[PDB]
Amino acid sequence: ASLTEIEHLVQSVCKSYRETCQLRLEDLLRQRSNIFSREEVTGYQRKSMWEMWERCAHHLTEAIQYVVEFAKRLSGFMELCQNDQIVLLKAGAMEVVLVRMCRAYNADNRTVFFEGKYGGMELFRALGCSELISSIFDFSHSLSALHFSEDEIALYTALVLINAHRPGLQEKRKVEQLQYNLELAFHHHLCKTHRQSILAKLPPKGKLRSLCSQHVERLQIFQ
């Protein structure tokens, strides 16, 4: 599986990402100045956990939808069997959602974009999940320091999803072979862009898994 050919793989992945990222980077950057007032924040803090949750769960389900679209446009993903398609999405999707959040986060003032404006962690107080929210803000913050280009995220999240060590896989070797080509592609694009430095700054092995184990833990869905 050759080199001119991983060059096309890099371009292609980067395109799928761009075609499924839901909010454009430009808009997020532009809207940074648009912050929630002291009153608009109080409004959100007054609502019940249940209304926050509805709003949050709808935004998540749309985001997952986009992640699933992204996967479906990566080379070879659609050629894997259905059970394997599912096992990779079930295991990675919310991890990708989480990494995609860092583009909507603003290290200047510890704020994130949500429903048309930018807001600190206190916006989400009726959820009663200060610990979890707070550790999402910290992961988003130490990711914002890498100044991850859009293409690096696309390649990195392609590797979040395409992972042959997910328990449950049945054609492991065909996943391995997609994963390998994607790893080379990321490496090679880092070398083309002089950005090899970022490989050592990326989430320690398992930081993402365990933040997702913790996140998936709220099924407020049950009620």
Ligand X SMILES: CC(=O)Nc1cc(-c2ccc(N(C)C(=O)c3c(F)cccc3Cl)c(N3C[C@H]4C[C@H]4C3)c2)n(C(C)C)n1
List interacting residues with ligand X (CB under 6 A).
Answer: 53, 56-57, 59-60, 63, 97, 101, 112, 114-115, 124, 127, 129, 132-133, 136, 218
Instruction: Name residues whose C-beta falls within 8 Å of residue 74's C-beta, 6 or more positions apart in sequence.
Output: 12, 13, 16, 158, 161, 162, 178, 182
The two structure tokens encoding residue 194: 């002089």
Note the helical H segments in 73-206.
Answer: 82-101, 130-144, 150-161, 172-193
Minimum gap (Å) between residue 63 Cβ and ligand X? 3
Minimum gap (Å) between residue 145 Cβ and ligand X? 18
Of 9 and 97, CB closest to ligand X:
97
Crossing angle (nearest 10°) for helices 150-161 and 172-193: 160
Minimum gap (Å) between residue 189 Cβ and ligand X? 25
Of 5 and 69, CB closest to ligand X:
69
Minimum gap (Å) between residue 10 Cβ and ligand X? 25
Contact 199, 159 (CB under 8 A): no
Of 127 and 190, CB closest to ligand X:
127
Of 21 and 198, CB closest to ligand X:
21
Nearest to 23 by CA among 137, 118, 103, 98: 103
Of 132 and 198, CB closest to ligand X:
132
Minimum gap (Å) between residue 37 Cβ and ligand X? 17
Minimum gap (Å) between residue 148 Cβ and ligand X? 16
Question: What b/e string do you get for 62-82 counting C-beta neighbours within 10 Å, with b at 16 or more?
Answer: ebeebbbebbeebbebeebee
Contact 156, 182 (CB under 8 A): no
The two structure tokens encoding residue 64: 């997952």
Of 156 and 186, CB closest to ligand X:
156
